Every structure is written in C-alpha cells, then in structure tokens.
C-alpha cells in the first residue's frame, strides 16, 4: 500500500480529470482532512491520510478495506477507472447525461446510450467528453463518453449512439 510514483499519479490524474476536470483537488482537500492515493496490487485506493499515518499497526490488506478502490493500472500503463469511484466523482463531474428508463436498463447491462434514451445532457458537452451518466431520478449509474457534442445530440437519429458506455453500477450492484 505505497504512494504512487509521479508518473502513476500523472496518469491517474489525467484519467480522473477526463470526468471531473480540475476538481480532483476537491477529493483531496476534504473538510475532515487531506485524503490520499495509495497503490496495492496495481489497484489504487482513496484513503484519508490520517488512516495511512497508522500504517504501522495495520496490515496493508486491512488498510485496503478502509479505503475505496478507484481503479487499477493496466499493462498498457493506462489507468482504468472502476465504478466504485462513482459516488466520489459524480458530485464533481461538470458534464452529465440523464437517460430514460430503456437506456437506463441497457446501460446497467453494459450497453451504450442511444438518442432515444437521452433525457438531458449538460450544455457545451464536447464530443468525446467524459460524462457521468444518471437516471431520470438523478441517480448516478456510471461513466460514459459523449459520442457527439450537445448540439449534435439534438440532431442525430433515435437509433444513434449518444453516449459510449465505460462503466456501470450493474456490473456489481446485482444486490450481491
């Protein structure tokens, strides 16, 4: 459960920024103290610094359980974001898409959002912008990438993909 190298940090920072822009600082400078990132088995954990200062009396695998996995580094040296990071990033994601019931069901089965299921999308969402996907009830469902800009989304046919699926809460919230 070690600190990330400067290169690991950069890579993860850039990926996270694809969804929350310059808001990662909001995850680090919390009201209750500074939080940090630590690596354990290629998986990156978000944990309070206070918890880490006590790494002496607690095993790494117990420390593992105290933090939240945000994702893992791939052999291609990319950072794959895990849907477990959704609750933390969602409040800080500027570009959001709200999808209808049909799209919601498909997305939770790991599929893309088609135009017919687009309920609302944030203004000035650029093509390929990382977005957080929500239900019409404003519930975070996962991560996606805008297939078209906001303006272009208004103009595609019902069957066209408007959001590429990246990760969803169906992959695990099976209720078990």
Swiss-Prot record:
Region (N-terminal domain): 1-92
Tissue expression summary: Expressed in hematopoietic stem/progenitor cells.
GO MF, any single term: RNA binding
Domain PUA: 94-170
GO cellular component: cytosol; nucleolus; nucleoplasm; preribosome, large subunit precursor
GO biological process: ribosomal large subunit biogenesis; ribosome assembly
Coiled-coil ranges (or none): none
Classification via InterPro entries: NIP7_N, Nip7_N_euk, PUA, PUA-like_sf, PUA_sf, Ribosomal_synth_fac_NIP7, UPF0113_PUA
One protein family per Pfam: pre-PUA_NIP7
Region feature C-terminal domain, mapped onto this chain: 93-176
Subcellular location: Nucleus, Nucleolus
SMART domains: PUA
Keywords: Nucleus, Ribosome biogenesis, RNA-binding
Highest taxon of source: Eukaryota
Family of the protein in this entry: Belongs to the NIP7 family.
PANTHER family recorded: CYCLIN-DEPENDENT KINASES REGULATORY SUBUNIT/60S RIBOSOME SUBUNIT BIOGENESIS PROTEIN NIP7
Role this protein plays: Required for proper 34S pre-rRNA processing and 60S ribosome subunit assembly.
Assembly mode: Monomer. Interacts with pre-ribosome complex. May bind to RNA. Interacts with NOL8. May interact with SBDS. Interacts with FTSJ3. Interacts with DDX24.
Protein name: 60S ribosome subunit biogenesis protein NIP7 homolog
